[PDB]
Amino acid sequence: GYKFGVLAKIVNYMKTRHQRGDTHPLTLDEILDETQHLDIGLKQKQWLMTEALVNNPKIEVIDGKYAFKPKYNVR
Amino acid sequence: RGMFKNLLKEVRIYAQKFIDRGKDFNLELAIKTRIISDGLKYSLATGNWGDQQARAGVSQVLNRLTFASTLSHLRRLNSPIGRDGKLAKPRQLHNTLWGMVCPAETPEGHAVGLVKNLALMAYISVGSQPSPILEFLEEWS
Amino acid sequence: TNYKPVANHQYNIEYERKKKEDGKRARADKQHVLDMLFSAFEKHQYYNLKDLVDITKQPVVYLKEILKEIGVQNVKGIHKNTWELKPE
Amino acid sequence: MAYQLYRNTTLGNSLQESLDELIQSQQITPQLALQVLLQFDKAINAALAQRVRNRVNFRGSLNTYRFCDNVWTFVLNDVEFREVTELIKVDKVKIVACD
Amino acid sequence: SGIVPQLQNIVSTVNLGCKLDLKTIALRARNAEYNPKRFAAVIMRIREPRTTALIFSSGKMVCTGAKSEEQSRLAARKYARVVQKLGFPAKFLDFKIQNMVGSCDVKFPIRLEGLVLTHQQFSSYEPELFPGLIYRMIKPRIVLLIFVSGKVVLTGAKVRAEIYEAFENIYPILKGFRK
Amino acid sequence: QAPPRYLLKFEQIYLSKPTHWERDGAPSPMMPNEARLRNLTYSAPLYVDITKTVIKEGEEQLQTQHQKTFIGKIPIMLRSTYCLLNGLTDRDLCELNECPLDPGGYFIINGSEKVLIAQEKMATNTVYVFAKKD
Amino acid sequence: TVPKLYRSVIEDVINDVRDIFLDDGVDEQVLMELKTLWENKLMGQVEEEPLNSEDDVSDEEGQELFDTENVVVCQYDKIHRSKNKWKFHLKDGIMNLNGRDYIFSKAIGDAEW
Amino acid sequence: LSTMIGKGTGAASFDEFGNSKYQNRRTMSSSDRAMMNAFKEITTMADRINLPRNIVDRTNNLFKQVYEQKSLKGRANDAIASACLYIACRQEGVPRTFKEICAVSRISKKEIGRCFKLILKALETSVDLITTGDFMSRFCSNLCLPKQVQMAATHIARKAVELDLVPGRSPISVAAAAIYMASQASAEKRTQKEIGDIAGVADVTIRQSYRLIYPRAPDLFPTDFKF
Amino acid sequence: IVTVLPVPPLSVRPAVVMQGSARNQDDLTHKLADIVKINNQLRRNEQNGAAAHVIAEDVKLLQFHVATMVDNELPGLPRAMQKSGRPLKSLKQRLKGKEG
């Protein structure tokens, strides 16, 4: 398949990165480096920018970059 | 015919149950020998002519009281007209029963004219395929 | 020659033979079965549990334990309550 | 991403050395060398599976036997390869097999 | 009686007390065989004791093939040494013998049919399953394999004295059925 | 269906003489008088040849001609041709403890002598015109 | 016989890698050059915790490290255990016996421990 | 205590989609369902080799005692069923071989052996050891052999058992050997394959018993046989 | 409208003999066992809390069973029968007609 499979490998990786204590936000390409998704499509990139990373309640927009939402979650 | 249909349905269910799991099946255990051996027994024993609303009293215990009783019981017929029904027409002796059925032989009581038995010279035709007659007529004009 | 005394049925001995070399489903690591399940999810949206067991080739209880974390049951009155492989 | 058994042979060593010589001259990328090794492994597997129609025999004594992830690592000492056309004597052989 | 049984194998289970990686042992042990599709354990043989043992990820060793209790103890110690040489902190805790098998010959044939006739509450003899009689008495925890040829096998024992007492409590019984 | 395809086709129908199987499983011919005295059922076992054709989608159609298999028993009407008393002389009938003047034409079920009376119906495949007076 | 099989292998190799070379944009000529080089290169212890009381219970570990001797690359169908021996059933495999390349389709053997 | 709801006579009980709205729920517990299916399996299994109904009822009695003993839940009900069939065939003095039960059952000989071993261990009963003379009548009659062959073969089998030519040999092998004795001495003759077909023992086992019983042949025979 | 069902005594619906150990009961006893079973099932399912359609179909089934206990010959509903035929003898079949 295509356009619907890489988002899970992004979200679980960033969740596990937050589990290591990396509260600081990360850019799209920085997440794409360690998720072996360097050949990802440009339309998938803009789809992640405009819909996929704003509709979920676990993604925070901090100074233009994307991070976890530990404030909404209970800690 | 009905019971062979039942046997085929049963072996179909068994073969499906051991073919959905994905292996071959042994034919000897597949065929239930219970069905044919028991149902014909049940129907001849009880006289109920079906797999228990069907016809009743088709089969009777043979009337071993005298030799004439045995013969008259073996050569008997039976009408399906409801024996309790207060009718008049089908029970009457009809003109076409000439040498077919005895005009004197009739039980007394509620079954007068519904039960009757064959005359001395009456062979009931047992059946034949109409294919030879049909192809014979096709040969002619 | 009917119901000849035989120590084991031909179908039975073939099936029991075929269960020796195909083998029992070995418990695999989590990363490989996760990659397998998301790759299968890429093909089609919904799946039945028995179909996921056949495609992934994993023990039912273990696969059920892995997909309990990320997948979730959604009720469908058309046939049965089935699982969803989507994390959300 | 294959069986990868024939790489540790004389043929595989020669091919790997040739690819190293091409890499040191910057003629090809190492990814192309890995693809060439993969295609060579598939081709030799197919050729051995198809075109070979002869039988050999061997006898010997075993000292150490090994199994790990469908890989055997037997060693054999005092090995006599017996064939209908020739007999070969050899002090020690190491047997590797996969599936 | 004048005859004592001779052991062939002793099953002893010991616990190393620590979790182990079976794949790591399979990749690093000298005599490793581990197939996940066939069984949940890794098998290990050595030739000078001529003994077999197997290991689970739970850290438990099951050893079988020893000729004496000291032989089993030394074999378990050697296997513990082998597994701790791979970098795992293996120990030697709660060692216990769980089964022993011995075999002997009484050098005379036996009428097994009479033996199951007089000991029907303890004996079970079916030729179509297995040609030898199975005998199961009470105060020993033991099953006996009495054969027409005279060979008698003892299985199920905890100690060696159990093997002797289960031999000489059936020997006078077996003497009365001499062909 | 399952893919492999299995097709079972039925064939020639065999019928044997009436037999009785005792406790040890010994098949023996069963006398009609033996059926009456022991309250038995006079019946004959029925046999069928079945051809089982296999399909594995690789052109391996190798059917097995599975031979005469036991499927049931039909209660035999006495003195029919498929009965033990068929074509027997009077001396052999008397030796079998059966009356030579016995007409036959009756089954034995549980030892009871059961006869079928000929039912009667309106003839099939022929057109009638009736005048219902109401 | 064996060199003819090698030429057949080389033909299958150069037939099987054309699509990859046209896929990644690599020119044809390099293949021929590779083949040229490929043709030129060959032709009472009451305290049971310590275990150091025993020693020399191991053999030499360099047999697998050397790999100088004959290494038989093959595949197996069934290998069976017989209380004494290992029964062998092998499909097609290859040898390197004293430099000469041997080949087989089936092999039956045994070994003693 | 229950009742069945049948099919409706009038059409007033049908819904807009049919289905008559009134049907039998057929709950009847799980254990009763298991016993009913087991009894159906026993009847259709025993009818194949034509057993009398006394053995069937004894089999049902043993199955109910085992099922209420509550010790054999870990094994297929069909295994306990065929094991109880073997026990009931043993206890009436007309024993069948394990292979004869295996022919009319979906279960291997290993499983039926283990289940029989667990039934005798658990239910606490004793069974008589088989003798050769029990199988002789069934084997000769199914092979269609006359009474003199029956008596000669039974005498041969009992004499071979008592004189001790066959230490530890199975009674089934020496029984078929006595069949081969009585067969290869008269006008009618039976091939090794037919003997193995009717007995279930392999032709090698018949040759083993033949070559071991062949010396001292006239002593095993009865007084008169018409050689 | 009935809300309690009067069970008849053992004199009205006694147990019959056969060979002995059977102690077969009257058809009223069997149907009343069915009535008590369905009523207990409904009474537990009231607070166990199934769907509304489950309660509707179960009370309709109990309607049918109470009716066929009282009156069986009425058109429309199928006759309540024992195993293997023999439509059971309800109160109409015990009072009306020649052998009533």
Swiss-Prot record, chain A:
The modification N6-acetyllysine is found at K3. It is found in: Nucleus. Residues 1-75 bind DNA. Tetramer of two alpha and two beta chains. Interacts with FACT subunit SUPT16H. Interacts with ATF7IP. Interacts with SND1. Part of TBP-based Pol II pre-initiation complex (PIC), in which Pol II core assembles with general transcription factors and other specific initiation factors including GTF2E1, GTF2E2, GTF2F1, GTF2F2, TCEA1, ERCC2, ERCC3, GTF2H2, GTF2H3, GTF2H4, GTF2H5, GTF2A1, GTF2A2, GTF2B and TBP; this large multi-subunit PIC complex mediates DNA unwinding and targets Pol II core to the transcription start site where the first phosphodiester bond forms. Belongs to the TFIIE beta subunit family. Recruits TFIIH to the initiation complex and stimulates the RNA polymerase II C-terminal domain kinase and DNA-dependent ATPase activities of TFIIH. Both TFIIH and TFIIE are required for promoter clearance by RNA polymerase. This is Transcription initiation factor IIE subunit beta. The gene is GTF2E2.
UniProtKB/Swiss-Prot annotation, chain D:
It is found in: Nucleus. GO terms for molecular function: protein heterodimerization activity; protein homodimerization activity; RNA polymerase II general transcription initiation factor activity; RNA polymerase II general transcription initiation factor binding; RNA polymerase II-specific DNA-binding transcription factor binding; TBP-class protein binding. The keyword rRNA-binding does not apply. InterPro entries: TFIIA_a-hlx (IPR009083), TFIIA_b-brl (IPR009088), TFIIA_gsu (IPR003194), TFIIA_gsu_C (IPR015871), TFIIA_gsu_N (IPR015872). Its main location: nucleus. GO terms for cellular component: cytosol; nucleoplasm; nucleus; transcription factor TFIIA complex; transcription factor TFIID complex. CDD domains: TFIIA_gamma_C, TFIIA_gamma_N. It comes from the Eukaryota. One of its GO terms (biological process) is positive regulation of transcription by RNA polymerase II. Keywords: Host-virus interaction, Nucleus, Transcription, Transcription regulation. TFIIA is a component of the transcription machinery of RNA polymerase II and plays an important role in transcriptional activation. TFIIA in a complex with TBP mediates transcriptional activity. Belongs to the TFIIA subunit 2 family. This is Transcription initiation factor IIA subunit 2. It comes from Homo sapiens (Human). The lineage of its organism: Eukaryota, Metazoa, Chordata, Craniata, Vertebrata.
From Swiss-Prot, chain E:
Keywords: Disease variant, DNA-binding, Host-virus interaction, Neurodegeneration, Nucleus, Repeat, Spinocerebellar ataxia, Transcription, Transcription regulation. DNA binds at N9, R45, K60, N99, R136. Sequence repeats lie at residues 7-83, 97-174. Its main location: nucleus. GO terms for cellular component: chromatin; cytosol; euchromatin; female germ cell nucleus; female pronucleus; male germ cell nucleus; male pronucleus; nucleoplasm. The TFIID basal transcription factor complex plays a major role in the initiation of RNA polymerase II (Pol II)-dependent transcription. TFIID recognizes and binds promoters with or without a TATA box via its subunit TBP, a TATA-box-binding protein, and promotes assembly of the pre-initiation complex (PIC). The TFIID complex consists of TBP and TBP-associated factors (TAFs), including TAF1, TAF2, TAF3, TAF4, TAF5, TAF6, TAF7, TAF8, TAF9, TAF10, TAF11, TAF12 and TAF13. The TFIID complex structure can be divided into 3 modules TFIID-A, TFIID-B, and TFIID-C. This is TATA-box-binding protein. It comes from Homo sapiens (Human). The lineage of its organism: Eukaryota, Metazoa, Chordata, Craniata, Vertebrata.
From Swiss-Prot, chain H:
The lineage of its organism: Eukaryota, Metazoa, Chordata, Craniata, Vertebrata. Transmembrane segments: none annotated. One of its GO terms (biological process) is transcription initiation at RNA polymerase II promoter. It comes from Homo sapiens. This is Transcription initiation factor IIB. Changing R106E: Reduces interaction with SSU72. Inhibits interaction with VP16. Inhibits RNA pol II transcription activation induced by VP16 but does not affect basal transcription. GO terms for cellular component: cell division site; chromosome; germinal vesicle; kinetochore; nuclear body; nucleoplasm; nucleus; protein-DNA complex. General transcription factor that plays a role in transcription initiation by RNA polymerase II (Pol II). Involved in the pre-initiation complex (PIC) formation and Pol II recruitment at promoter DNA. Together with the TATA box-bound TBP forms the core initiation complex and provides a bridge between TBP and the Pol II-TFIIF complex. Released from the PIC early following the onset of transcription during the initiation and elongation transition and reassociates with TBP during the next transcription cycle. Associates with chromatin to core promoter-specific regions. The modification Phosphoserine is found at S13. Keywords: Acetylation, Acyltransferase, Chromosome, DNA-binding, Host-virus interaction, Metal-binding, Nucleus, Phosphoprotein, Repeat, Transcription, Transcription regulation, Transferase, Zinc, Zinc-finger.
